[model samples]
Target chain A: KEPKIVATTVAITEIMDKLDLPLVGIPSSSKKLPKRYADVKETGSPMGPDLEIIRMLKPDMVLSTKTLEADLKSGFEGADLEADFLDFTSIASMQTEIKNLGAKFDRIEEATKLNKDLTSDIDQVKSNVAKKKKPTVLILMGVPGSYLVVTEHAYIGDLVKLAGGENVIKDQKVEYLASNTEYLQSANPDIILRAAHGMPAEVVKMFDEEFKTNDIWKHFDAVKNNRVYDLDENLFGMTASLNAPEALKEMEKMLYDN
Target chain B: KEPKIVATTVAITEIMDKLDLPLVGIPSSSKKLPKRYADVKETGSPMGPDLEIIRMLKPDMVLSTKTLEADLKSGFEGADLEADFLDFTSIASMQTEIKNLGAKFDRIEEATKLNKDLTSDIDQVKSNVAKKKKPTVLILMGVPGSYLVVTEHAYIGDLVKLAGGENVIKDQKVEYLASNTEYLQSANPDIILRAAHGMPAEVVKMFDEEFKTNDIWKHFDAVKNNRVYDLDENLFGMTASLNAPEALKEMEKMLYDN
Candidate 1:
């Protein structure tokens, strides 16, 4: 018999559901779920799960991202449960994780087909963007006063690279960097994007408030030239799922046209 | 290790969630789920699950009502799996099943608390309703031409007993009965209710059309007096769950007030 499965994050839920694996539990308990899993059991939010509930569910395998399992690893070990963390750093890592999960689920053909399609989709976007003039870009996350820049290795940063956007902090290989006013003025990226998932109205408002008040941001080429775009969280957040093709197209429109 | 679990119905999903057990899969993929379980996997619908996917997930136990498991038992057995069928015909059965599952999950305390609460809840409604004059109720299911009467052994029929309402067919003992206009006319129930689940607008429309067009239904005292109601499926469906208390209350209201 195959392992009873538990998903620990929205990303994992999305990916695993796409793989047609029967899931036993999901970290989220919200209306965002589709019809296929609208009534699945709740294990709490992806920020953390109700461990007691999860233990009682007794999933043979739990699915989560690298960051989530890192904190819960020992706990999972204590429970004698297998923890599978799918890497979500770069597109390559995301693709690799999907392929590995597919093999684990014994759907290698599905995985291979998915990867091939994603490759072609990504390649098409890259090809289109390669012809456009590269623009310096700075991706920001968090509220304005405590904003951070997306480092090269982050999921969205990789997409930016493929979209022919020159990340200002090219040499820094980190996930995110704290905002430095002086550094921003010097680097002066031509395009600015706020990283948000779900993209609720409040998130858009928060970024707008930052732009309205911050003189340092105004001085940047991107801000001065009206090149800032609010990237949809589903497409640009840490997850790199089957939505890559559409995500790439959105990135192309934002980078070249905007 | 906690025993692995999967659920094949909304009724089972509701019960397991009430027991504080995380679910690996749900039979439904609907929008009506609570916020606490929005991320669970979809395994098709309640009428029929993806049995192959269920086999692949390999849950230690699969939860369903007696009727559901009866048809799917062979498939589950073929997969070398254990399918636990919970009897949801009566309140006592539901409470017993809760206790059994609680012991298995090692959350006997929580289960005890829930059972106590549920007992008290049902008792409250029954006591309040016991004072009222008993009404003869004819609970019909499905469309008029093929409608069946809900019997004493079924979930709704049992609720009728608790609500101090008499089943129109007092001597007949069965889960459901096929439509017989002559027999129904002879029974002459005081209150008429069509037992339906989800109760979507379109279903209501269909029932309305049937009621408006059917001469025999219009002849009934309940329908003529506008004492007919569309019972919510969750409250009066074949499989009882955590919603038992609420179901009792709603049944009490329909039996006495209308």
Candidate 2:
């Protein structure tokens, strides 16, 4: 009997699921949750979480990323609750969080095995990537016209490294870069992967429409070669999820096989 | 006519002061402010702002770090105001923020000149310390017994690198690593810099007491050599401010001259 948990972001939800911990609540759409978490209560979106709903659940511990912590902390305080934040970014952290969660649940054995499994997945990706020349990649989170470059400081950036691709915007000052047509042409990345914000099918269709109509979409090397990809949101929407290994495999297939 | 400005954090206040931008309102503390902003109206603390007072001021824009965007943006919106966010994290972004403020104030010439001057300050410190061998440094936040290691991703971490100091916690996934005696012993850093959260006098005194009383801290080389220092909040509090050059010079003095 550890504590009734409420998961906020996809990364936390995925990892908690792997641990087989029953969550009382989840954020974003309850419909998008896997079969395991389908029956859990909804607590609104990550950006605008329902503090009152979270209070109703009476979760002993609320899990969230730094993205929502600043706003949620005060809200949690207002609701007489406290939040514990995990600053997750890289592969090492994925294992670290797994172990920490394991300790929290008194399931150290499960956590150890899960960590071992994640490591093995990352190792496979790294070796496969090593076999190929690293491709210059541009990862974006929005549509082609309003897209921003994802930097190496993020989990996607780490996955890019693991999957044998270089994030051309890694050296940029900020985590997200402005979408400038001239700048994109100058950078001329070999691949353009968009982390879809909605359902993969829906987001891909949206990109398909943009590829035909957007003024700046056709000029890039990625679109010219048809290397533009729609990344699955489950694996990439938030920070690296427990499905990060799955995300790594996805990147490997896209960057190497393509 | 200058644009009436309101500052939210120490870093923004410092940058605005460097650009000679007129500030109509600043966060509650008047002690931390420079001579120029002495007469400015105090709205509230950095974390808890006075929205009523802010509306009363009737400023052009409220300048703040990205932290306040979640709660304050809505508050500003409710008051029919717009708040601009500056994601100030590292040295590079500090320069970017300066240019951004310059463009907003339509003082591009002054902004360019200030940036040039900041670069010169950083260059001078780099060159001066380049002649000396790099020292292994451990930068921590919080008081003595409760401190956590600052990562290479942060402003203090950047300053450590700029001042020719090697950080021990280079491979951790998060920006802050929990401190442990065994880990500290294993690290055995030659120098230590603690970013004092409150007044320098109190934090330094607290550290002095901890170094004297704490068993594990006594064995550390930095404590034994009296190389540990309290970093000023205005300069090295959250992120690198406009006085980053001065902060760099401060590091150069501490690391090399000592």
Candidate 3:
């Protein structure tokens, strides 16, 4: 009796599973996905979903993050398919999306339990560092040969903010910006966090060489103090997912030194 | 012939030794003094030097930091003693003081070599982080049960600046001010450095409890990001000393994460 849904992103797919909803189609990823979607049709990549394959699945609704809404909305509209772009910018926004999905699907109990667990963990971590001074942080997202600075609007930055770290890149409208080592050095963050994507090992190697060869990097307080950390790709993703609590826990350790 | 000199503080005593000048009197402390002043008369604590002992030594001049000049100048004037208070607030000022001492004591060669070495290390560190962004920093001076925020004018803050860190507590004329967690959190420094003085272990413990219990501290970017660091008392003093190069090196590491 559940509505047939097509989840275009891994994060959305995972959220649907948690909400006790059955998916007619699921995103294709090399990464491990929920067992509930084993028999579901493949929806191609999150960035470029196969509209023909999706339309054949006869989904009642399609779910994706607002991050990709701009690009995907037109295609869904042209295909005459109903779709929803959920906000996944921060934990609070993501929770709201989850609650809305639950209401739409009549799975309020499942959504409430999931949200409760997430909030409880977050609150516990917040209480732990209530008396400690907030740390300033610089987040770097690396590709094969270069990197960019991440702002608070990004999923990882939001996680850091919730964990009690202030983002050095402030008042930014975009999720990421071009790397400016000169400006970054001026910000003088206490901690530098590097997140590698798209050939992660290669990107990490690139970051390592950049820090070592870039003479200006040695002037950073975070680099000098050994507070530069390379985040795990599995735990930290571009979008918010079910592993958020685990990610938050890891962030708390880095921020609080416990 | 060298002038008969009485060094009221350990830092002054050490500087005099580096200038190859003999001291008629030196401060009393458990810490090791230069072998050059092995037989020198003890001048009691730097805070309250023994005026009678210093006068009996009959030194032509007395040297101390400007930091204690306000309190000690009156007593010295009443005793009809000639004294000089060197500026030790920043490395540049400290170097100027050293140069002046060199010119006065005819130890220009020693002073030049000493300053060259210090500048070489400092310049090397500056060049290293020239391209990196400046990190925002928060400095805390911890006492028994409480702590204060340090301004850029302080010795430790100066070191942080040279190491390419921007102090969050800005544009203050005083060295330190009463801590305001709310104001500090708003500033959102990337790193928080704690310097414990006056019963160090007790002060550190007190700082620990404060961070653990103060609800507002949880909002700090430094605390949440685990960028809080406890400074070494020997390397990072309240005033500049000969070990400033070592201190600057340590600070560079903390600020840059290299």
Candidate 4:
């Protein structure tokens, strides 16, 4: 288990970790990387890798996702170095990317086994969620006094559909729009698995003063039943990292644990 | 040389010791007596007095500028008392009320002397501004982020006019309204006063950063010049009370004192 994995953002490293990669993990997301990672050299932004640093630490090929292609392509062409980029913005992309990485590293068998297990785990969670007693739940982000119903292009929204739970906000494309008081008052949700997996950190603790505005404080059956749960932002939010597996696990528990 | 005193606001007994009144005092307004008055019992809003308590304490029949006769009619009739309610909703009514009060208290001579001195003080200040300099001043209440501006019918606006300082909000009919950032930013006042008096007790502190809006960061010449002052609310606001003389003293200092 020679550790040599370097991730720009914690999200990237989190994804690599989920793939069960055997390499030394170095995270560059720290303001100034920790003493150990700081020694590994610097990257510009989360996605910008220093060419000199990458060259010195070269393993075989520099693997990156399509999301970073446009940014990295020009630099490589200008430098006369061919850096390989793959499309890995979704679960299917992740599978293909992992297989490609495995093929490049000559670990195709290990990559196949890992992919099979991931699909099974996700499928189980999906079936378990579909059989759950609760009504289809919408995934949304709730701030201090505002809530945003996210639409498409999010990992959690996909997970909700897979788990047999309906996403009330999956049709809305806004990443974070101000919560509509009237819409929320009428939505009458049975349970709200918030966009993030946990409560907002700015406030000392979670309190539902937001519910008091609509005079639905006492009127909502969900409030009376205490069905609102704070979700962890790191887990439920869109990220390209290994932590998505943990998020998946948490979703499974929430969807089935009821 | 006894304090030819006027006790305003029927809370006189509450602070009776503070005044050395060889006095002619009127209950400026109070609906009820605390325990008992001479025999005048009040049962109106804070703008009128208790007739039952008035007869028992028989100092002088207190005349008020807010002639709330309809409210006083029932209580006076109940107590079998008779007194003229002046029409003091306007300047003429106010002057007549003052003249009538002077007649009742046999202070017409003292009242005349008070008026002459007050008029001379106002005339000199007005002429000084007309000939010397006129300052544009803004008044604020509550917090810096949401300062409530004292407008028309307010003594704050009136006092500002008298001091040769223009009240930026005098034309607004409401006594106070929350000002917008646009209005405040554009005006860029020369003098800023808080009817709040002395140190900001509620929200604003010496520094704007403590409890202020981002729009107000040290940009105000009024703030940079350190012209913000908070006066006693009861003394400087709509109430014409025992504190009026004290208000006059302080306002004169801000206006004329170098």
What candidate 3 gets wrong by more than 4 Å, as runs, is A1-258, B202-206
Q: What lDDT is reached at residue A239 by model 1?
A: 49
TM-score of chain B of 1: 0.91
* Candidate 4 ranges beyond 4 A from true positions: A1-6, A11-25, A30-52, A55-60, A64-92, A141-148, A170-181, A195-225, A256-258, B1-258
Tens digits of lDDT, candidate 4, A6-87: 4545544443444555433343453333333335444445567666665556433444556677888786566554456655
Q: Model 1's DockQ?
A: 0.01
User: What DockQ does each candidate score versus the true complex, computed on alpha carbons?
Assistant: 0.01, 0.01, 0.01, 0.01
Clashing pairs in 2: B28-B44
The TM-score values for the models, in the order shown, are 0.50, 0.47, 0.50, 0.42
Better of 1 and 4 by TM-score: 1
Question: For residues B1-258, what per-residue lDDT tens digits would candidate 2 score against the true structure?
Answer: 778899977668877777778899987653467789888898865653666788899989998766345434655776676788786667877788889889989778888998898888888878887778888988877554456577787778888888888998877665565566688777899888877544446546766677756787778888888888887755665556776778888888888778
Model 1 stretches with alpha carbons more than 4 Å out: B1-258
Q: All models: lDDT?
A: 0.73, 0.74, 0.80, 0.51
Worst 10 residues of 2 chain A by lDDT: A200-209
Interface RMSD of each: 25.4, 21.8, 23.7, 19.3
lDDT of 2 by residue, A116-148 (tens): 988898888887667677889988876434677
- Backbone clash pairs in model 4 (N, Cα, C under 3 Å; residues 3+ apart or in different chains), count: 33
